[PDB]
């Protein structure tokens, strides 16, 4: 669950693709 957070950081989400 809150793994599922961090692995999408304010960043992590963005640079998801970059």
């Known amino acids: 669950?809150?793994?599922e957070?961090?692995?999408n950081?304010?960043?992590l989400i963005r640079e998801?693709?970059?």
């Open 16 to 18: 998801k693709s970059n």
């Open 5 to 7: 957070l961090q692995e």
């Open 9 to 11: 950081q304010p960043e």
């Open 1 to 3: 669950g809150e793994e």
